[PDB]
Nucleic acid binder design. Structure first.
Ligand SMILES: [Mn+2]
Ligand SMILES: [Mn+2]
Ligand SMILES: [Mn+2]
Ligand code: NA
Ligand code: NA
Length: 320
DNA sequence: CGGCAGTACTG
DNA sequence: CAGTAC
DNA sequence: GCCG
């Protein structure tokens, strides 16, 4: 990063807008920040600033104030509420609206939340694991978790295929959670397995709390046996083999990579989701789908890139 | 002016 | 539905 | 916030 002295200050305003609910402005900051993190050289002119995609007038002005002054004065007017809003929205299941409501109602600390707030089932689990869910795990531990889920899955059906996606598959040395994708090449045997799979993972004490228990998605909490172990977030998705390539693409990410590809598909009258790549999609004035189009055959990730006119990228080059 | 990705789950 | 999360 |  040739522009840390700039990016460091912008990230503060980005987080501030984000926890206060100004999501599009925060999105603009996030994009500019990675634009800057990716410039080869330091930014040293206003007109150089505008040269970068994702940096416009208002952002170039801020970068200019920063180098001429070493400071950004907007930093000195950020609401006193922002650190508390960040504290509260780091509870899993509590976002900006819940955080702002708790703040309005007088709560200022997690002790206040614990003793006085009315929590959803999910948020009570989030609070109980507050510290652990802010911690990443070593890659090696993600492997043991993936293998734990796969052994329990293949006990029921040896044909089941399980793959850890997310940051693990992008090759990162540490992982925020473990994202396990499960399918079956027979196109049928994936059905109805969650019941038994999850009950198998509880019987041993591995699965400790459930956050979401859907027909296709499980989100929850696990902990490997023995001393020195933290609770870890675990996500499991079960998909039909027909959708494996698009599900793998989605669940490998990164988030900004997915958003970028899906935005590209839209420009081409196509639609990309965790289910399928579709073409001939009909949309209205506002970019919203009004006609579904046709699913395109995508047996592999490479096919999705190809049909979008893009060169293939291995997972590690998707870490955007 | 207005989109900024597309979807699943919860109550 | 709004809210939240992936 | 940026950009078409
Ligand atoms: Mn993940
Ligand atoms: Mn996850
Ligand atoms: Mn713990
Ligand atoms: Na630009
Ligand atoms: Na949260």
């Amino acid at each position: 990063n040739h522009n840390l002295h700039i990016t460091e200050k912008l990230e503060v305003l980005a987080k501030a807008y984000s926890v206060q609910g100004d999501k599009w402005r925060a999105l603009g900051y996030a994009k500019a920040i990675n634009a800057l993190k990716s410039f080869h050289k330091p930014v040293t002119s206003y007109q150089e600033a505008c040269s970068i995609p994702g940096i416009g007038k208002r952002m170039a002005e801020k970068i200019i104030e920063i180098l001429e002054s070493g400071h950004l004065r907007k930093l000195d007017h950020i609401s006193e509420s922002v650190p508390v809003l960040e504290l509260f929205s780091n509870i899993w299941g509590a976002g900006t609206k819940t955080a702002q409501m708790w703040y309005q109602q007088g709560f200022r600390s997690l002790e206040d939340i614990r003793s006085q707030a009315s929590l959803t089932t999910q948020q009570a689990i989030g609070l109980k694991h507050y510290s652990d869910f802010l911690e990443r795990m070593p890659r090696e531990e993600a492997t043991e978790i993936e293998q734990t889920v796969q052994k329990a899955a293949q006990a029921f059906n040896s044909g089941l295929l399980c793959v850890a996606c997310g940051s693990y598959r992008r090759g990162k040395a540490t992982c925020g959670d473990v994202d396990v994708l499960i399918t079956h090449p027979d196109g049928r045997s994936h059905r109805g397995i969650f019941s038994r799979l999850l009950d198998s993972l509880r019987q041993e004490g591995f699965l400790t709390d459930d956050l979401v228990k859907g027909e296709t998605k499980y989100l929850g909490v696990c902990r490997l046996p023995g001393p020195g172990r933290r609770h870890r977030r675990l996500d499991i998705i079960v998909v039909p083999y027909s959708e494996f390539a698009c599900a793998l693409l989605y669940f490998t990410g990164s988030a900004h990579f997915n958003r970028s590809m899906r935005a590209l598909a839209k420009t081409k009258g196509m639609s990309l989701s965790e289910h399928a790549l579709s073409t001939a999609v009909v949309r209205n004035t506002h970019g919203a789908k009004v006609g579904p189009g046709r699913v395109l055959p995508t047996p592999t990730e490479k096919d999705v890139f190809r049909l979008l006119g893009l060169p293939y990228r291995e997972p590690a080059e998707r870490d955007w």
